[PDB]
């Protein structure tokens, strides 16, 4: 209907609760392995944030896997920063991590993150 | 870190994708039964929006159920309107449905929805 009212803060309040569930390991259904490191998450949140995870978890075989191994070239700290961004909207971008965050966001297919990384690098040239 | 940047639209863009997954029946993990009607959903979204579903899906036995039956007094249209609100932030509140939406929101423990229903009823007295 075109006669709906809207609760402004609803989407933000939902995302905060999804991050609380992740913190407490409640109903997490996949482990992402990045070299020696492991990260527990919810497949639906990963798909909602990333073109790579959307493709993986809509595949008729990969949708049922409980472990996904990323390319060995991916930096674990870069992945951790992006997983935190998926669950909070906040990106911890610093001089010391920007190259790893940008390469990881290109692999994960997160376009707006790639674009702000490019802008911050260009400003320092 | 206190040095994070924030993408304003991120939470809203995530919620839109969760509703698209529900529309296409992708990775839905529970059926909610309301008398003769059935509704497919994601347990994590239900818990993030409702005090009743948060209690149900954190229980050591009920967390593993694939079907949940609601009280026979609950109106299916009232439940459908609230499920759509959970996945969109938009509430289709009308003269013809407000009493059923308010009773359903009290049962589901959705406080801000109960509060706007009370305000709209009081204005018509």
């Amino acid at each position: 209907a075109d006669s709906c009212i809207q609760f402004t803060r609803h989407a933000s309040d939902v995302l905060l609760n999804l991050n609380r569930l992740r913190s407490r390991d409640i109903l997490t259904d996949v482990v992402i392995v990045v070299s020696r490191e492991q990260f527990r998450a919810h497949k639906t949140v990963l798909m909602a944030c990333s073109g790579l995870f959307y493709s993986i978890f809509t595949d008729q075989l990969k949708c049922n896997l409980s472990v996904i191994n990323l390319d060995p070239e991916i930096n674990p700290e870069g992945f951790c920063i992006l997983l935190d961004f998926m669950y909070t909207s906040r990106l911890n971008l610093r001089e010391g991590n920007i190259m790893a965050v940008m390469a990881t966001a290109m692999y994960l297919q997160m376009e707006h993150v790639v674009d702000t990384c490019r802008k911050f690098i260009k400003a320092s040239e | 870190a206190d040095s994070c940047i924030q993408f304003t639209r991120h939470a809203s863009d995530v919620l839109l994708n969760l509703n698209r997954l529900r529309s296409r029946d992708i990775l839905t993990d529970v059926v909610i039964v309301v008398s003769r009607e059935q509704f497919r959903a994601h347990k994590t979204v239900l818990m993030a929006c409702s005090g009743l579903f948060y209690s149900i899906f954190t229980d050591q036995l009920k967390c593993n159920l694939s079907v949940i039956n609601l009280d026979p007094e609950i109106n299916p249209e009232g439940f459908c309107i609230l499920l759509d609100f959970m996945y969109t932030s938009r509430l289709n509140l009308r003269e013809g449905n407000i009493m059923a939406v308010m009773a359903t929101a009290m049962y589901l423990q959705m406080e801000h929805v109960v509060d706007t229903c009370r305000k709209f009823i009081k204005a018509s007295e």
Binding site: C4, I5, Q6, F7, T8, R9 | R90, H112
Partner: peptide, 5 residues
Amino acid sequence: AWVIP
């Protein structure tokens, strides 16, 4: 909160 979207 509530608004007209």
